[PDB]
Design a protein around this ligand. Structure first.
Ligand SMILES: CC1(C)[C@@H](OC(=O)CCC(=O)O)CC[C@]2(C)[C@H]3C(=O)C=C4[C@@H]5C[C@@](C)(C(=O)O)CC[C@]5(C)CC[C@@]4(C)[C@]3(C)CC[C@@H]12
Lengths: 325, 329, 329, 327, 328, 323
């Protein structure tokens, strides 16, 4: 596992919450699976059974392989808990890989989805706030010497449409279902007695059915089941911690706060209306991304400064505003 | 599987191709290759194709000769005695190779499309985008002059593409051959799953040449095709993937049933753009170009301004050219 | 392979050559190359290509020596006694190498082309492109002045190219040598496939030198040329690919029939452009240059505008000079 | 190793620098240690051996080594004086190391994602205001040689109220220090292990191997490379015992802040001669920290520094020196 | 072999050298290199290069020691009992190394012509190219003004190069060294293939040191040079390729014969250019200069224009001054 | 060594501090990699001759138990002591740690030094080029402010020593690590090279009262000689590299050939070099003179200085000729 080391070295020298969730739900299982087959620890193939010393070297290899393949054929298997334990033991990494790919899916669905209207409208609302700020500045400057609620009308329009909000909520909900299923499964793969590996096999079929030099049966054990157990426990912890994060992300209206337009509501060139709260609509998601990327607008910083000044109350809107420039 | 690890790590931290179709190609091409790689994992695939449990009296190199001779004898159908038939063994020896072949066959349509079908539609999209930007600019300049040629060229090219069917035929052909390949490989794989899983534990006896009359040789060897259950579970997964992708491929095939909002309606509020969208209901490049417009319309910011105007008109607050002047695009 | 497929997967997420010929080179190079790669696949290549089932009394390293000596003896024809003959031994002992040599031979003609005649075609294409753009500019300026030299230069270049076949000779020669290569390789591969499939299970007796009158040696060992089955499957695959590819090469050879839909008439709607395309049945560099112009005609914006105008004139909605001024090129 | 070799070869060929180096060490030391733990030269082979009787077959002994090595999970089964806990720790020592390493690496990412953008934007804005103020002052001095509101100072007073970013940075550093504490505790614990668990008795006598007779009772089963783990863990423990006070001093926000840059802007008539930015658990302090950090990025900051150093000599008049600057 | 496989796959995904010579160097480089890489192909390479079937009494490591001892004993000519001699075995061992040496020797003269004779070539090229461009521009401006100095500069440079025989000597030398190289290498290749192919099997007797009087040792071991037939087949392929390439080398040597299709004659229709082809085969650096002029003259747009005008004058329907004015 | 060979082949087809860092980083890394090479690593670390009666895997367990016993001081029987066994066990690891430690100060210093040095250099270059252009304009006007700003910044850095202190600290910790690792390397070589031939007796646990086991096996620590030769090579490399850092230490003494003099002949520049004899950032910043080639105007000033060196022409006349 030197490739992960190099990934960190180049590390050394979409909502942020969703980005972090993707990061966790991606690395934890992927890094886990890479760790399981890590060359230093990937020593051993989990077929050990010590067939009688009379069995030749290659005879022993055949025993090991025939059992390892017989993990599927239930009739060949003589197990206490059942074959499905053995199945889980064999595909445990493959199962982890499938779960992880499934979890990475929804973010990819969003990425190729790109939330087209959402990103374009983000750029649009940015340009609109910028133009409104420039217009207010020029108006105050002339005072020292159209008019349609464009962004406000766009917001009213978003107040009807929730299609993108439906997309966001569906992505989050698919994420939650994924992690819930994976956590249940991973606890199940940790719900093992951990005794299933040491099971008994007898490859006495074919010409080996009536063969005599063969022993009655072989006791093989599935190694690294303890390792698989430990890694499943780690991933289960990670996901039992991650699920509340997905839950909190699911409550977007409960999260949409700290009105950014509140400062721009002090603008005469802007409609005096926050009008952004309490809705299962793309208004909420657009407002969330607006709070997310709102620092990117220099005028947003200026508006925060003016809002603080009004909180300072030393100056008035017009004088200090025109002074801002 | 360090390849997928690095892919995800970098994943951690014009279109000229349909997003649905791009993702379908991506999945249906990788998932088979992905499964093949995951099985070709030496940690997963450590041993040979099949062991034989030869007599202990046989030498280690003798055991190797037995193993290899049977594993090669899977081809000679007369060589081994199996109830299922030779085709099972053949499939088992060629399961990964056949998987790779199907994957290459699936990669072929996107490649051919990009080589031949794509560039012309790309140039067409570029021309349409230039026409749209120029028309929006001209309408905005007229609106500005009011606040202070004339040939429907883009509409003409649209009416022409309404006759043009070649490109639509090419796209539909790529998608259809794709779906056909998906169905064929799906049947093949499901049959590969249909394998009773008993062929693996077959019997071979290499008694050719002097080994025909050999004495120290036993009667025969019990060889067991390893990774038979592995290949079968992979076949199940791949068949699932393909039975799920096929409906997506079919819906992608339906161009008239794509049922996309008329992007021209956003430019239909232009004075400089005649009021006629008329882009649907034809087994021609008409519908395909309409779909590509619905696709790459985000690449045109003027399309974004038109959509903003459309939303404003949905609010019904103001008048159209006055709002255009208010936009000053 | 593992990493070959990994790079292939991460690949996803002026023509100066015949696109058809480009794809032909691609297939005819990849099929053998990917096949040879499979011949060195870890899952496919299980180990050495020979196994001999020596007596168990023979020591381990003794068994290795026997295997190797028989393997080298596949060349020494008097040593190995096979009912088929030595030539099969030659073949399925160097079949991969032979495939690689054939693939290199197949990549040779396109390399010689791209090195020798390709820059000539690039210069000719750039020159014709400049000529067409200049004609479009002059026509647009004259149409605008109406709204307010003249020598057949491109036509002269066309008449000149209509005489010489030198570049056409080069292109046809590359294609024809390629086709000969395809036919020879196909015959070869079919031959190698058309093998007993049993000759591999030959018998060797390395009783040379002191081993001639040696006693502990068996009279002979029944040795097997492993992987012959997979070699045969791969040869069949490649032969099928080539039987599918050859007619494409033939169609490439037929250049006149390949020459179709001359765009010289898409500029013939210009008065400052000759009304005589004179662009058919030219068994000379004419045909090749015209084909490459048909290929890269999309790159010229004026070609796009002229195509729009040609469609409009087919649609019959606008006068030629009026619509020309309206497009305002 | 090899990837490490390439990293060193290219080596041979906005975030707090102290924090950057802290994260860098806290990542590389365990990562490099783990990589060495699988070094082809260092890692010599399997981690467990028990010298089963020669009567046991080769592959038989292989099965023994394997089943024993796995039996470490089987708590009741194994025969050790220390218990299943130390052998367990050795069973996944590198796993624990990697968990701790990724855990330590997370908070820097959370920072470089959450507090990074706001601080970056605010710093760009403050530097831009500084540059515009310097331009305005030089221009006014030039015109004399022939608004006026504390805008950036207003933003400073504003940040002096909010401590949200300060809270984020402090929490990042604090969680990181907590990780260092717990990890160093664990590491010393693992090294504290008496190197006795390595050698112990293993008896894979379960099932038909329980009532099997050809099997001996047990083997003397030797966990391997435990000494290597001990030495590298000691190295890491020393590294982290050295690093923890660095994290502490980093957590010292009012004390790390020194030499207020605002004095350089305090040489301005057009910009208030007032730092008024220190001594507070507010985002003001961290903003001042980053101002001191990337103030070298501001060329006008360099001009102010040279001018202030000259005025320390007292050579020329401040307006005269400004006019001579002609920046 | 997946390295070169992916290399050629992504292959599918000024000149300062003669195209013919470029192809010669390319082939003469790849064929031996490709063969060598084939020799170390894991599918192709079966394993160790020698095997001798020591008695089963000899232990495993004993057998390995025998194999290696003989393998090195191919050098000690007395220790090896060879009817053909030791030099065959010598050739067998370094056979790849021999091919690698031949390959490096094949790549050297291309490198010499690459860096050496880069300055003169590029200088003459850029200079004569700018000169032709200026002559075309001047003739065009002259026709435009007439319808409305005087020094044969590049012609003078050609006259000067007529005396020059330095770069001509260098090119001839690069070709000649290459020809000698390929000739000697092909002689060697046949000689290697000339070998009996039964010499590959030879007897070794490791009775040195305490093995001189050792007892458990047999008298000898009969060991075989493995994969010698493969080296033989490779030498066959290389010998065929080089017997094919050598005549191409000779053709490249014949520079004056190859010098054809006078381009300055196409420039001889220029007013600002004197009527002097000045293209005579001789022991002059101009011939190669003329050769590369023919090579990269396609890079000259005005060359294409002049060729068009030349076809027009061959049509004989347009006046040279009138058509020149028409050129625009 | 295929990767490094390809790297040098594609290579084939304070600067002093940079080179010292490069060498002192690669030589240990190069040597450790050389040992890491399996071509050099012809065998496992210890192959130690158990009895033939011991099974293959039994011998494996012996080699493993002894190789682990290289730490357990009671377990092994050696005259030289355990510390030899320790050193031999982690000699590669020791090399790697020393190399990382030696690469650290370059990273830390360059990090600290990057902004300060680059900004001061850019500002000084701007000031010098401005004074040069101004003198050129004055000469051109004669053919037809007044503050020593760069001189002020120079005198300022002549006061502050913090950055020079940082440079000295980087160099000093560097020399300290060099000396420590050099003594260590000679020491590991100083080893009598006899410890490898130690005996181990794995009679622990049931092996205490086990009987089929021999009392012990005389086991050998392999690659001791290779590691020793590597230590000798690296130690000589460091004994050669250290006096370079030593000369670097006397940097004020090392400061020579004042570059400011060529700028001192300007009219727009006061005739005063004033750059020597200080434990301050002055000489450090002067070590300016390092990358001073980037200023074409500096090249012109040097040319004018060389012209006046012969005394052939007047300074302003030839200066205006230069323009
Ligand atoms: C090289 C490796 C280790 C291995 O190679 C690998 O798997 C990779 C690791 C490596 O290459 O070292 C392949 C198996 C093998 C070649 C192996 C073999 O074939 C058969 C035996 C026999 C087993 C035995 C005791 C019996 O089984 O009764 C009878 C005596 C005898 C001859 C002892 C030695 C070994 C164990 C022998 C020759 C030692 C070398 C060994």
């Amino acid at each position: 596992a030197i490739a992960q080391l190099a990934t960190e070295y180049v590390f050394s020298d979409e909502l942020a919450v969703d980005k972090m969730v993707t990061c966790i739900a991606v690395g934890l299982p992927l890094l886990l699976i890479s760790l399981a087959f890590a060359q230093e620890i990937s020593i051993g193939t989990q077929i050990s059974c010590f067939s009688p010393s009379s069995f030749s070297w290659r005879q022993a290899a055949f025993v090991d392989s025939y059992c390892w393949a017989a993990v599927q054929q239930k009739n060949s298997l003589q197990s206490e808990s059942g074959n499905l334990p053995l199945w889980l033991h064999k595909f445990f990494p493959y199962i982890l890989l499938l779960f992880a790919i499934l979890l990475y899916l929804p973010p990819l669905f969003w990425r190729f989805a790109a939330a087209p209207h959402i990103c374009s409208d983000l750029k649009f609302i940015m340009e609109e706030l910028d133009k409104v700020y420039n217009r207010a500045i020029k108006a105050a400057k002339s005072a020292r010497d159209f008019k349609y609620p464009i962004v406000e009308q766009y917001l009213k329009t978003k107040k009807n449409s929730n299609n993108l909000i439906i997309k966001y909520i569906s992505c989050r909900l698919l994420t939650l279902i994924i992690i819930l299923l994976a956590c249940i499964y991973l606890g199940y793969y940790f719900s093992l007695s951990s005794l299933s590996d040491e099971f008994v096999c007898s490859i006495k079929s074919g010409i080996l059915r009536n063969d005599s030099t063969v022993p009655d049966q072989f006791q093989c054990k599935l190694i690294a089941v303890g390792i698989f157990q430990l890694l499943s426990v780690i991933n289960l912890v990670v996901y039992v911690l991650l699920a509340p994060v997905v839950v909190y992300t699911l409550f977007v209206p409960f999260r949409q706060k700290t009105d950014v337009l509140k400062v721009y509501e002090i603008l005469p060139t802007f409609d005096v209306l926050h009008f952004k709260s309490e809705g299962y609509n793309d208004l909420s998601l657009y407002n969330l991304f607006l709070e997310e990327n709102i620092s990117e607008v220099k005028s947003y910083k200026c508006l925060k400064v003016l809002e603080n000044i009004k909180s300072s109350g030393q100056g008035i809107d017009p004088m200090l505003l025109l002074t801002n420039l």
